[PDB]
Design a protein around this nucleic acid. Structure first.
Length: 436
RNA sequence: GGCCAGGUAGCUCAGUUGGUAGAGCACUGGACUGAAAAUCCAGGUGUCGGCGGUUCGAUUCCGCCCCUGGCCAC
């Protein structure tokens, strides 16, 4: 054990439920988050270790705060409270033993990292902390240290969390972690697939993510999870450096998306929800990772379609959404289109036909496609003239869409009259002529 | 409570832009057979999980539910 800021309102609701003879402990992330003094976000996650009945506790607590109560999995209980601006999650876990303190420490020693192993008493919050793993000492040094490499081997998905949190909380992972990763990167494959997928996305969520992705490529964890990435190396132009730099540039372009896309294209950008907590932005970055996955398979003619099917296979395997992998695949197939239309514009051969076709085929990925094309044009070292030509091409497409665009009898006649419309009796006579 | 994948004949499974339904085991009858095996030919009354919505037309598109399975601490 080592010795106001730790306060959360709903902790009161924990005290008005929890019995007089039972004790409660605040454990894990929320402590670390607060020790770092990091801003409490709109998403709040708190973890508890209680000596009372987790089911009863969570039930009455949930009835108090007006959230939904549920249990899963050493069964752990949870309460979820969700309204549009803020979302709370409280995980309640059982703590049993003859000795309280010994049991608490016993639990804390099993956790993934030092900073996560810190715990406090709920009553002292409403300040003596428990960190047998010496978390705080590492937090002062800006270090993220696994409690044991055995703990990381027991639950290999933690190996991914290390990469995430270190970037997310801006900490430096210690040496034994990287050493152990170097040993067997493949270890992550021991835990469940959906957890790896979820962590991968959670990494793709933050804007420094390209650094972590590079770390996963160099340490070969990414290859272990996504084998098709390793096949970017066998072809020399450096393709892997090209794609990773394409990703970094895509994040830069994403931050600059306001000055590139028009207002109507920026309107709904980022609003598509995938896997519940993630947006089409993550899908954009994933699209940047896979933007050329087809070059090793095939000058490379068909590599975009091949890319699409490969991405589809990956989405199938890694248990993404159907709509998520569909979106990313569609993003990959069309990845070279703005360059083609750019080539049509530079020679002045681009007209209403090609624009109409472009907005017909894919209008949904248009902003994503534009940003991605810009990023790729940056990573390939295109001359400034070419870049500006591309951005003016994009300008022309948006300019075209914004203003300049304004048994079977039903099936063919309706479609034909709708196509011809894109004057009742006249059109009727036209349909009558269309019949013969 | 959240995400993901499935729901189609008794069992078990296909079906990328909307039309009228498909296989195999199994089951019934029949044929070659002293007999049978096994093989060939014929037989599917399916509220395409459920109720609405757009369409003349929904297994397919959209919306809301039901059921089964997989995941959900740090």
């Amino acid at each position: 054990x080592x010795x106001l800021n730790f306060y959360l309102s709903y902790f009161d609701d924990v005290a008005k439920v929890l019995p007089r003879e039972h004790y409660c402990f605040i454990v894990g992330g929320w402590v670390r988050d607060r020790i770092l003094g990091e801003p409490v976000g709109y998403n709040i996650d708190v973890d508890f270790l209680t000596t009372a009945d987790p089911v009863e506790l969570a039930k009455n607590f949930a009835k108090r705060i007006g959230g939904h109560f549920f249990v899963f999995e050493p069964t752990i209980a949870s309460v979820v409270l969700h309204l549009p601006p803020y979302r709370y999650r409280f995980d309640f876990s059982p703590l049993k033993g003859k000795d309280l303190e010994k049991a608490l420490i016993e639990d804390l020693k099993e956790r993934d990292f030092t900073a996560n192993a810190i715990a406090v008493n709920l009553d002292d919050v409403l300040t003596i902390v428990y960190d047998p793993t010496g978390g705080i000492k590492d937090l002062e040094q800006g270090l993220l240290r696994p409690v044991s490499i055995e703990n990381l081997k027991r639950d290999p998905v933690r190996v991914l969390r290390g990469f995430r949190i270190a970037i997310e909380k801006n900490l430096q992972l210690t040496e034994d972690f990287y050493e152990f990763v170097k040993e067997d990167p493949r270890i992550v494959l021991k835990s469940a697939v959906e957890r790896i997928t979820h962590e991968l996305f959670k990494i793709m969520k933050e804007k420094t993510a390209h650094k972590v992705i590079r770390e996963l490529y160099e340490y070969g964890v990414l290859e272990a999870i996504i084998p098709e990435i390793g096949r970017l190396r066998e072809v020399k132009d450096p393709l892997d450096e090209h794609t990773l730099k394409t990703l970094e540039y895509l994040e830069q372009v994403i931050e600059d998306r306001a000055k590139y896309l028009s207002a109507e294209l920026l309107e709904n950008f980022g609003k598509k929800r995938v896997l519940g907590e993630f947006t089409d932005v993550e899908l954009l970055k994933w699209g940047a990772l896979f933007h050329d996955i087809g070059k090793p398979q095939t000058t490379f003619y068909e590599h975009d379609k091949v890319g699409a099917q490969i991405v589809r296979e990956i989405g199938e395997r890694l248990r993404w959404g159907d709509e998520a992998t569909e979106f990313v695949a569609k993003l990959v197939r069309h990845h070279l289109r703005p360059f083609f239309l750019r080539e049509a514009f530079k020679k002045g051969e681009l007209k209403r036909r090609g624009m109409a076709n472009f907005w017909r085929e894919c209008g949904d990925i248009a902003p994503h496609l534009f940003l991605l094309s810009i990023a790729d044009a940056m990573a390939s070292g295109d001359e400034e003239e070419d870049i500006k030509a591309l951005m003016e091409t994009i300008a022309e497409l948006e300019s075209f869409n914004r203003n300049e665009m304004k048994x079977x009898x039903x099936x063919x006649x309706x479609x034909x009259x709708x196509x011809x419309x894109x004057x009742x009796x006249x059109x009727x006579x036209x349909x009558x002529x269309x019949x013969x």
